[PDB]
Amino acid sequence: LTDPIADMLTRIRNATRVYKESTDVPASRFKEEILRILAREGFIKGYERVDVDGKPYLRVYLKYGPRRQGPDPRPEQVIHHIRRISKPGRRVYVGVKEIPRVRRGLGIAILSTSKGVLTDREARKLGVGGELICEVW
Amino acid sequence: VKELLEAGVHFGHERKRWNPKFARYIYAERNGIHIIDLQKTMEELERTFRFIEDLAMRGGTILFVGTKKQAQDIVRMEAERAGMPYVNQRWLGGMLTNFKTISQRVHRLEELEALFASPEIEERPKKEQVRLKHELERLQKYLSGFRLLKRLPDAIFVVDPTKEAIAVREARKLFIPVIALADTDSDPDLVDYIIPGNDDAIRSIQLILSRAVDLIIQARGGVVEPSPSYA
Amino acid sequence: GRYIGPVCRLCRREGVKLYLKGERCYSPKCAMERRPYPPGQHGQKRARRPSDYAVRLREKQKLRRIYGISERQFRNLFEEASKKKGVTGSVFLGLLESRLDNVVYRLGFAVSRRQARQLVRHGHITVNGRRVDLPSYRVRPGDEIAVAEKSRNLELIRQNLEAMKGRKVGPWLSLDVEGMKGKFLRLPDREDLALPVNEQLVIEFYSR
Amino acid sequence: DFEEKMILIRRTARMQAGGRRFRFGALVVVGDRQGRVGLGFGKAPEVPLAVQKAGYYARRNMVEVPLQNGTIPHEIEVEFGASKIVLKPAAPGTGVIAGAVPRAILELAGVTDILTKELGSRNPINIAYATMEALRQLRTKADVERLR
RNA sequence: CUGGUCCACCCGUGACGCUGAGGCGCGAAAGCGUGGGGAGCAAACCGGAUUAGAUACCCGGGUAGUCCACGCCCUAAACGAUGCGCGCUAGGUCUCUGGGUCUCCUGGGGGCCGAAGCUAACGCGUUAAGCGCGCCGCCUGGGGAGUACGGCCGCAAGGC
RNA sequence: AGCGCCGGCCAACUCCGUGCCAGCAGCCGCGGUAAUACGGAGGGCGCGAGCGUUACCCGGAUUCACUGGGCGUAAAGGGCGUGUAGGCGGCCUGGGGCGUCCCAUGUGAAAGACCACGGCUCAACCGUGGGGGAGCGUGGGAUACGCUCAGGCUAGACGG
Numbered sequence A: 001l002t003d004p005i006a007d008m009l010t011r012i013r014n015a016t017r018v019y020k021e022s023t024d025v026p027a028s029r030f031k032e033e034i035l036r037i038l039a040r041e042g043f044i045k046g047y048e049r050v051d052v053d054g055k056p057y058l059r060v061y062l063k064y065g066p067r068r069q070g071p072d073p074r075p076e077q078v079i080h081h082i083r084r085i086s087k088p089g090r091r092v093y094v095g096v097k098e099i100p101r102v103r104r105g106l107g108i109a110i111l112s113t114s115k116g117v118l119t120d121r122e123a124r125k126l127g128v129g130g131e132l133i134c135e136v137w
Numbered sequence B: 001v002k003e004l005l006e007a008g009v010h011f012g013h014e015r016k017r018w019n020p021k022f023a024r025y026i027y028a029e030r031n032g033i034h035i036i037d038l039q040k041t042m043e044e045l046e047r048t049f050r051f052i053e054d055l056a057m058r059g060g061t062i063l064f065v066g067t068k069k070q071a072q073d074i075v076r077m078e079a080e081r082a083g084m085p086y087v088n089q090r091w092l093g094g095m096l097t098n099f100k101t102i103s104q105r106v107h108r109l110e111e112l113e114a115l116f117a118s119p120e121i122e123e124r125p126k127k128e129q130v131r132l133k134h135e136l137e138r139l140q141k142y143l144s145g146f147r148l149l150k151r152l153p154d155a156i157f158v159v160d161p162t163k164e165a166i167a168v169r170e171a172r173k174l175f176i177p178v179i180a181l182a183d184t185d186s187d188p189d190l191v192d193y194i195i196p197g198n199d200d201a202i203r204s205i206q207l208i209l210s211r212a213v214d215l216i217i218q219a220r221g222g223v224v225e226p227s228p229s230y231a
Numbered sequence C: 001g002r003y004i005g006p007v008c009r010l011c012r013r014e015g016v017k018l019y020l021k022g023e024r025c026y027s028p029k030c031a032m033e034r035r036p037y038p039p040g041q042h043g044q045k046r047a048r049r050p051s052d053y054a055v056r057l058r059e060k061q062k063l064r065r066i067y068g069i070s071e072r073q074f075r076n077l078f079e080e081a082s083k084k085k086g087v088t089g090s091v092f093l094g095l096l097e098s099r100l101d102n103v104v105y106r107l108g109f110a111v112s113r114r115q116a117r118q119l120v121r122h123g124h125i126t127v128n129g130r131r132v133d134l135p136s137y138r139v140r141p142g143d144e145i146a147v148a149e150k151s152r153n154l155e156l157i158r159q160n161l162e163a164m165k166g167r168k169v170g171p172w173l174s175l176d177v178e179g180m181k182g183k184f185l186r187l188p189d190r191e192d193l194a195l196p197v198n199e200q201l202v203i204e205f206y207s208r
Numbered sequence D: 001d002f003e004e005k006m007i008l009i010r011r012t013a014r015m016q017a018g019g020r021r022f023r024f025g026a027l028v029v030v031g032d033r034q035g036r037v038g039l040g041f042g043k044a045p046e047v048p049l050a051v052q053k054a055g056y057y058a059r060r061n062m063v064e065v066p067l068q069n070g071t072i073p074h075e076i077e078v079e080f081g082a083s084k085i086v087l088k089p090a091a092p093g094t095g096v097i098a099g100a101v102p103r104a105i106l107e108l109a110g111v112t113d114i115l116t117k118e119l120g121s122r123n124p125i126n127i128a129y130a131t132m133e134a135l136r137q138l139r140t141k142a143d144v145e146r147l148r
Numbered sequence E: 001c002u003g004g005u006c007c008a009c010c011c012g013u014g015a016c017g018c019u020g021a022g023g024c025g026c027g028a029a030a031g032c033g034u035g036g037g038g039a040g041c042a043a044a045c046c047g048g049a050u051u052a053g054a055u056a057c058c059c060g061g062g063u064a065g066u067c068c069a070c071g072c073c074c075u076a077a078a079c080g081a082u083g084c085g086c087g088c089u090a091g092g093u094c095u096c097u098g099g100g101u102c103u104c105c106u107g108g109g110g111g112c113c114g115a116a117g118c119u120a121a122c123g124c125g126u127u128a129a130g131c132g133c134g135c136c137g138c139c140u141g142g143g144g145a146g147u148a149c150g151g152c153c154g155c156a157a158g159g160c
Numbered sequence F: 001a002g003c004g005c006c007g008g009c010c011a012a013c014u015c016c017g018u019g020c021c022a023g024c025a026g027c028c029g030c031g032g033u034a035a036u037a038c039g040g041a042g043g044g045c046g047c048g049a050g051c052g053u054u055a056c057c058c059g060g061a062u063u064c065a066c067u068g069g070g071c072g073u074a075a076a077g078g079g080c081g082u083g084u085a086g087g088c089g090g091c092c093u094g095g096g097g098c099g100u101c102c103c104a105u106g107u108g109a110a111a112g113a114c115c116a117c118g119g120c121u122c123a124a125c126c127g128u129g130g131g132g133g134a135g136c137g138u139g140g141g142a143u144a145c146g147c148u149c150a151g152g153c154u155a156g157a158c159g160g
């Protein structure tokens, strides 16, 4: 397991595409700060530090839209799209002036700065840049 | 009307030919057979019926769909009771999506009423009185419940959504709600108002269709009680 | 230089009246009144559906032929508008309407933009007192387009200013008749000129 | 009512003994230039029939596109099979920068200012299809907050 | 004599890991060298048919070879035409092999059908061709051509 | 006032001549006695002191794909291991602050590019004034992530 951050984004994405109420990821302080933002932006209902077989996990409670009417009842997602940006094979860093705007504004870019994990909107306010972790909408 | 003595009537069946989406309506497996959470049946049934009465009280029609030989005769019993359409024989592809055209077929049945009524030329060669009476009886076999339907229904009541997946496919294609009685071999997400329960024992089908009709007739003014039920 | 050949064939091709002569343009002897179909052997044959490229080309040629201006100068004015600020469509027509020969026409000094050009070119016009014989001169807000004093006793400019004594002009213009001089107030809107031209199609033509 | 525009009329053939026997296909988009657009593909043994049949499905398959000042809210990229379509919001003085196929769909839906690009297979059918699904997934700041 | 591998216990070490340009080893058959062996079979070869002809298919013969030891050769439809590792995403059914408490449950293999999803389609689908991360190899229109030149390897054939 | 073009792409059609000839041709393709495709003519389209042609560069070409591609059957997984360098790497804590982020400051010539004004009657051309940037030197600041150093842990891996 070479990229826990991309493994968590993928655990969520695989979980949301089958409409799970939750899914557990192996826990870490950097992961919680990333989920901390998904809640504070409504992409998730939130998480809780659970344990499985004696090992510290993060149970992430997923969130979807209203049921739909037609041949496809399955409801619209709330996290339509979440993908890794900076990777172990290619670190990606932006200064404050080059922070991108995910989806014209309707989306969030998650950064790690020396003022902590922040959205692109948060980061522009505090005027810092950092490692472009991922993007969500 | 939501009786709790349905436990004496079905509590579900069907071993492991299940559909994993139906796991949310299961309690355990007794003989290695899947058995249904009757409370989950209760809760849904209440929400299900809350839809049904609302539709009767506004003069909305409900097309009853059952073809499996178990529910086949009793969907005729209870839907003739409620004076509402049924389909008990072969379901005909396009009975919703191609309604105007299958409805061109009941018009023909209608004219064979006003023809074989009498006496409009029985001076047609005996091949014809033999032939049309065959067509008539044939049309009668399949359209006896559908002719009552003169326009796209506002809901359909299916007794097996797996068996009647075609009808579910048409009604969903037309944004028509689908109430149904499903057991473990069916896909819940495809039905709008669920009745999670055995759909093979006439026991279960009678206790659900009749009590469904009891809500229909009562919400149309003037109630009535016991209706047919073979032992 | 500019196109100098038969000018009614343009209108007949464009399917609309372009007022490229002034006087005869309002008579029953106007070509579009008698033969409102394209010139040549096949004008009276049934038109087939034009390609999208034809449509956009036709609109562009309609707009360009109106001013009697070259495709070169046309395209250069357009490119300026494309690099200019805001909406290219408005600015294009605005910079078009700011040509000296065009303003001289709008002021009724001349009955046609051709006439205006020969007026400017022959130096019979001044700008803020300063004589200018350049048809492509860009007029600016606040200017003043007068008849040359050494030309005021000219039959053609006389009859034309006669016919303008109380004729309106564009809101963006004024004209002191009898004094033979007007003012360019502001660069016009598309609203101020209902040219039979959808200009967006001209944008789309040059975006290919 | 709804404005229509033929996008594609092609003739396909099928073989039998005695030779080939044809059939026609009509790609028609309909819309009001106000936020409503539909696309339908019609096949019939003669051109006018197929054209008319295509207008029919176009009304039976519509999409409301959240126009905002004549552009789309957010940039979107959709793949339909091997065809890919890109749409990007654009300011007032822009125009509709698009190939013939996607231009017709955006124009009739009221889009006046958008940047686009076709990538992958440029099959007009699959490109027309990919443009509809792109419009169909456009979202407003409203729906974003509604979902969260 | 000896390698890999799985299971139960959860006892020891404490990230000691994944991949892997080069390198090194292994590498079906045919072929080569030295020696042995040679029943059956059988390139080449000879003869009989077949056929318009029949340098073939079929028939009767028949030498290398096929077999053994040691040394070379290093190719292939060397295929799942699918690099390795990890994590994640319905199930149903057959089967091999372990451990339970033996109803069944649970590991590791091997098949089939299929959820979601993927795909140009065919199809794939917890043995992914799905969703992701790491690293390596490779493609960039058909022919000319896996040819020529160079270099490296081989006894040669010929290989890279 | 001329030059190109008028089968499709691509805007612009008819008559005669020719009859797989003469010829056209950027691609697809035209010509075998009713050719909108050859040659002329009338007409038409496009530009205009120019119009076409040839050559070359970037574009269209996400057709070397960082942005922005692929490899079962389309071109594409190395025949298979083993392993060197290299690339990449688990949970918690602290030190350092190399990457990374922020602030200040020096540098970033003039011309050109861009915005505004103005000077040649306009423009080209030219003058005056305006705003930056990356990158690098310097000082100061941040520590989440990556790195490094130290100490722990057992979920990877290895061993009993």
Ligand code: SF4
Binding pocket: C007, C008, C009, C011, C012, C017, C018, C019, C020, C021, C022, C024, C025, C026, C029, C030, C031, C032, C033
């Ligand atoms: S007379 Fe008619 S056709 Fe001729 S130039 Fe004037 S408007 Fe055009």
Ligand SMILES: [Mg+2]
Binding pocket: A085
């Ligand atoms: Mg990237």
Ligand SMILES: [Mg+2]
Binding pocket: B014, B160, B183, B185, B199, B200
């Ligand atoms: Mg059943």
Ligand SMILES: [Mg+2]
Binding pocket: C019
């Ligand atoms: Mg006018």
Ligand SMILES: [Mg+2]
Binding pocket: C052, C055
């Ligand atoms: Mg148009």
Ligand SMILES: [Mg+2]
Binding pocket: C081, C082, C083, C084, C085, C086, C087, C088, D093
């Ligand atoms: Mg602009």
Ligand SMILES: [Mg+2]
Binding pocket: none
């Ligand atoms: Mg004089």
Ligand SMILES: [Mg+2]
Binding pocket: C018, C019, C194, C195, C196
């Ligand atoms: Mg006009």
Ligand SMILES: [Mg+2]
Binding pocket: C207, C208
């Ligand atoms: Mg361009």
Ligand SMILES: [Mg+2]
Binding pocket: D064, D065, D066, D138, D139, D140
């Ligand atoms: Mg919407």
Ligand SMILES: [Mg+2]
Binding pocket: D080, D081, D082, D083, D121, D123, D126
């Ligand atoms: Mg495609």
Ligand SMILES: [Mg+2]
Binding pocket: D081, D082
């Ligand atoms: Mg694709």
Ligand SMILES: [Mg+2]
Binding pocket: A104, D073, D089, D090
């Ligand atoms: Mg916008």
Ligand SMILES: [Mg+2]
Binding pocket: D120, D121, D122
């Ligand atoms: Mg393609």
Ligand SMILES: [Mg+2]
Binding pocket: none
């Ligand atoms: Mg093509």
Ligand SMILES: [Mg+2]
Binding pocket: E010, E011
């Ligand atoms: Mg232990």
